[PDB]
Design a protein around this ligand. Sequence first.
Ligand SMILES: Nc1ncnc2c1ncn2[C@@H]1O[C@H](CSCC[C@H](N)C(=O)O)[C@@H](O)[C@H]1O
Ligand SMILES: [Mg+2]
Ligand SMILES: [Mg+2]
Ligand SMILES: [Mg+2]
Ligand SMILES: [Mg+2]
Ligand SMILES: [Mg+2]
Ligand SMILES: [Mg+2]
Ligand SMILES: [Mg+2]
Ligand SMILES: [Zn+2]
Lengths: 224, 1182
Amino acid sequence: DVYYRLAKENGWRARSAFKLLQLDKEFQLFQGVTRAVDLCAAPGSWSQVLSQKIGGQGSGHVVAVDLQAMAPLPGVVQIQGDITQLSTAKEIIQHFKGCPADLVVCDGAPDVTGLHDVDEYMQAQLLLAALNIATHVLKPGGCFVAKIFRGRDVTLLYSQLQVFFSSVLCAKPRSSRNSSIEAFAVCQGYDPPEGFIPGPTRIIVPFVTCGDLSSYDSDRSYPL
Amino acid sequence: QVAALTICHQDLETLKSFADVEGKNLASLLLHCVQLTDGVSQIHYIKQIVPLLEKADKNGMCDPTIQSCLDILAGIYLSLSLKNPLKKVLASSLNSLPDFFLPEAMHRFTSRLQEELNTTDLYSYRKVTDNISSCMENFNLGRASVNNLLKNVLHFLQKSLIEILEENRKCAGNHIIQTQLMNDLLVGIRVSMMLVQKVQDFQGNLWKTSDSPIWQNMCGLLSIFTKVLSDDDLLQTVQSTSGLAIILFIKTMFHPSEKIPHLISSVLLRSVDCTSVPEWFMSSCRSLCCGDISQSAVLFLCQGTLAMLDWQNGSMGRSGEALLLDTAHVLFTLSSQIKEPTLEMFLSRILASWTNSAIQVLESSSPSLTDSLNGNSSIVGRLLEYVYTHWEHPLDALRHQTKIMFKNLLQMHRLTVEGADFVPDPFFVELTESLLRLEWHIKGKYTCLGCLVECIGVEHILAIDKTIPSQILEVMGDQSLVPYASDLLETMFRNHKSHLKSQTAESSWIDQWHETWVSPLLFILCEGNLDQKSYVIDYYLPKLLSYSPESLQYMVKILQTSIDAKTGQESCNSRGALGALMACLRIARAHGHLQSATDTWENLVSDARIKQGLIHQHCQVRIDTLGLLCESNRSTEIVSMEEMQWIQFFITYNLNSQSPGVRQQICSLLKKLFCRIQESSQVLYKLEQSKTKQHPSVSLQQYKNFMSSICNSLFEALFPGSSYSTRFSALTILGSIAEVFHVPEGRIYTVYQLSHDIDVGRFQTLMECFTSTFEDVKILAFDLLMKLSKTAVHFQDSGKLQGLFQAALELSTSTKPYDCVTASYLLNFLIWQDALPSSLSAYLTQDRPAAVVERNTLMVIKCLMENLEEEVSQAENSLLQAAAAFPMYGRVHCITGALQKLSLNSLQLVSEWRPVVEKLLLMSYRLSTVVSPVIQSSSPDVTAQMVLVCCWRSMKEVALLLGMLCQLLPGLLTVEQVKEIGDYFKQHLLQSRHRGAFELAYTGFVKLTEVLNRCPNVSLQKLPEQWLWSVLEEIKCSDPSSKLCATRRSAGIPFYIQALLASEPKKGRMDLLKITMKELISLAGPTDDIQSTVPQVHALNILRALFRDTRLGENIIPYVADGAKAAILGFTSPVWAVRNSSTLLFSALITRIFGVKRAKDEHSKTNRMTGREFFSRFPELY
RNA sequence: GCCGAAAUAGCUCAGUUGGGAGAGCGUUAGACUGAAGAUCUAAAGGUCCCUGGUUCGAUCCCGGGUUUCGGC
Ligand SMILES: Nc1ncnc2c1ncn2[C@@H]1O[C@H](CSCC[C@H](N)C(=O)O)[C@@H](O)[C@H]1O
Ligand SMILES: [Mg+2]
Ligand SMILES: [Mg+2]
Ligand SMILES: [Mg+2]
Ligand SMILES: [Mg+2]
Ligand SMILES: [Mg+2]
Ligand SMILES: [Mg+2]
Ligand SMILES: [Mg+2]
Ligand SMILES: [Zn+2]
């Protein structure tokens, strides 16, 4: 490919940066974003893109979190920890009392093994954690970008994501390897349920945590 | 190469006391022979030895001179190793001695052999055994001698075996010595079996009395054989051979012969009555009676039973048949219990041997055995179950043995149902129908169907379904199924042709044959997809054309028509016809079939058609047309002018091919053409000097012009900015020319010499090919420049070479990360052609060209080392400018590259090479210390990225340099230095905490570890096991506060364990693996202790790597099930890390068990296996 | 007419000694990230020109033959 070179040639810590930029020019992610959250940034390339495209104004605030350590950037605050753990979730949400983030990105992935079912399982777990963080932070009508692994069965993930967002789109930028099954779910228009706090919730939350339909079940014949 | 004959010094006077200055006697011939060096005229004089003895058949009493001559001949023969052909030479010569001289030669050679047998040196035993072996094969001199010394040779064999066993049990710890001792045991056992089989003394009883020394030596040998069979620390070859020997001796030594099959039967069933065997058997074979023998013992005993008994002619009778059935029962019982891979391979071989023995018995057996051995019997059912379970075993030997078993099963059934009326047997039909239900990706289907086709004939399979040939052709687009499909189709049409030439005896049958086998082939050739076309052309079409060459005329006529109709229309079938025609014609020409006609035909190919093919859009058509022109059956056929013009036309355009396979095929075919030119130029020259055709001198001039123009084209293709494929192709073809026409330099005539066509400028361009960014091009240019003659300073003046040296020195210190590769190639070129400046002689203190290249390497390495020392000191001062101005990894890379070219095992200036190696190690450690803290931690007009590049590149270069230096066979490398190197690799690779120094150190450590295994010093070859133990007991008490990191799939510990396990000899013993897997599986098991999570984590991280390594491969199977359990039981653990590790390990296990994916998307059934296979391979998972 | 050489995977080449046939290239599969993915892994593909022997067992030992050559 060519973007592995361009990552080293330019001031990008990894090739993955070019995946974010190519998702702007096709979805206009950085319309009016002022504060954004970056999940699972290994070297910080996505954090770098966000800082250069939002923090260039000066007031842009960016929070990056990963399982590993990162080289610090001007205008980005780094957190090391497992976003699956509740403590990391709490300290992340600690940064967003009052003003909520306009954009939440998640680039995480497990150690991709090659057979795709286990990758979907692990990615589903990571996406559930990321979605929890999002719903707990970003402002309604906001944006949530998340890496997914498009395998044979992707309807469930789309169904779950559609509940929380007005628009859900699946995109594969030019920088993504054509042999790889990775893709990106871009979620436009955060539209949380009316009775949802971080009626409708009793049906949605069980279905989003897992494909749990044990809310339409009944002990008497259904009304007509 | 031959070994010069030698003689005993004190024999000289003995042969001098009978020599004569005149030289009439044989003694003078011996003098002349021994005082020589060429082992060729000696052979001639050896022939003439016989007439000298023949010319004295009148004395009536052997001349003492002849006596001493033959004694010296015997002494020389017994002192000759088996690797020397002269040994067999004089064996053959003395085989033809005159009948008058036989008795004295008998007696005296007997005496020489006898005194040879009295040796007592342990390490001289192998030579004596080899001598006894030689005296048996087609050597009448030694056969009578050994026949006269049975007692002595048996005593020697017994004592030698005992002493070798004692020495082997005493030399535990060193495995090279143990390997040699095992080989000595093996040759001893094989020689003993030869003696018992091939001595005309063991027939009749004549020696079975207890007082006979032969009998007592035989009993002692039998006892040794039993003892070595029951042993388990020896090579399995030794034990199997021992089982063979045991059965052979029992068969030989047992007086009531008719009771031998019964007795052996009991021994196999472990149901022998200790109170009914003869006393000698109980004394010698106590282990065989009274139970408690391993499963390997029974396996090898039944192997010997099948191999070493007379199954033909029904000698053993009903007891023999019962023994056959009992052996089958025992083998099936063992099949379910054996789990070691090598033992499984042995069992497969033995089952195939059982089928052979069943064939032999069944050819004259009783009607009772027929019922128990037919295709519907239980035994054959179990055998078919074995075959179905095992045709897709990972081991190749297993699969081959299963094929043998299946073929023999069908033959057994045929023998049992010889009372047959109509050909298609119900059993065969049912088997065929059941096989046809399998999918077409099942590889065993093809082989089983081939055997069935040869059993019942292909007409019945075609009657069942007449679209089978098309179905088989449709899978031919998938490589790795192409060979099986090709073989099946070939079997099918061979059988079909044999069937059609049957009762219906005319010439029209071929038509039907054609429409069955050629028409679908033509359709595929014209309209198939690209992969299908390529594979059918490469694999299947040659078989069909070779079998029936008269079909070519049929194909061409069909294709030519489809070509001409194309011009009528100005269709796909008319579009692919040209490529198919070229493929058929290329195959026909290369095999010399009817198309061998002096520019490829009079009318099959025209100029327009050939030019169209040579430039076609499809790579396959271009390759097939080029092959039609280039390759011919006759290796010296003249290249015509038309072919030269077409080849020049082709070269103009086909140098930029993008497929590496296509490019490689093009280069190979062109090399074939150049070989044809070279070989026919010699014929032309011979005709020219021998004072229709065109006066061969004309053809020689044409060859010279053609080669010169081809070189012109190739050198034009090296213009600035030329692609990678065009430089690759040009340099490959130039190197091929240089190699092919470098043949007749010991000869007198050469049609072309590339060196004559090399100007100064062409040399400049060839050297400038060292600056290409691709290393393949650098390598090809280097090879081509080295192949040329008179090149070093002929093309270059001293000042410009000094400029080149300065340029290489400057490239070795540039910040660009890949200039050091160019500097290394430039420096190697200057070294290997003695083009270094004169000032470099000031670094060392003072034709064998190896010596001068070694001196040059030493000088340049010392210069690089001085620069490196200065730069490393300044880097210690401040790493910023070191990363900015003089990164240190370029010099290290150049040093390693220079050393890589030498033969480190055969240096000659060790006084000079010792201090340099010491300084090299010291500077490596200094540089590593400087740059490592930057690579574990974060950053400390120079960006941080280039600092990181400098640091990790230095890490990589130092690791590779240490791995290189480890190949000095520690001498120039002391044991302390090797220990320090190993410690360096252990400090990294376990404390890196970062991706750097995980795969960086692994390659160097693997090199060091393999060397450590092969080392003969005992203190060194025990290092890997000690390191393995150290790291394992480090793992148990991990204490999460340690420097070990969990991320990046582990703290490099899997790489350490993999490298240590790599030392184990390939398929040799694998004892480290058993220990490691026992400990890791135990660690990964459920733990009550909460703190015991981390030892459970690392295990699953290590195990994962161990289950995907290719080296461990088939040795890891007996642990899969256990590992699987762990993974599954680790998926339910409350801790997250244990579950994640379990997931990754389980992925690796799935890949190991079911194999790599066969196609990109569908995975219909390509990676599934039946329940029977899965639960036979891993029965503890059900 | 004698004498001698060569034949191993799709291609280019290794193979002391009788005990599972070795590599390179090409092909297939996998990879979220760095350190030219121009990289890493792990698979797949042969019974050694053909045919008889010797042997428990042959690429290897022995005898015939085929094809392509070299020498007299
Ligand atoms: N459970 C988890 N919690 C936090 N980070 C995680 C995680 N599982 C995986 N990750 C992170 O997922 C990332 C995989 S690749 C990340 C690429 C990075 N975003 C870039 O800009 O290039 C790694 O950073 C890994 O640490
Ligand atoms: Mg590194
Ligand atoms: Mg060879
Ligand atoms: Mg390869
Ligand atoms: Mg294989
Ligand atoms: Mg035999
Ligand atoms: Mg044979
Ligand atoms: Mg001739
Ligand atoms: Zn007993």
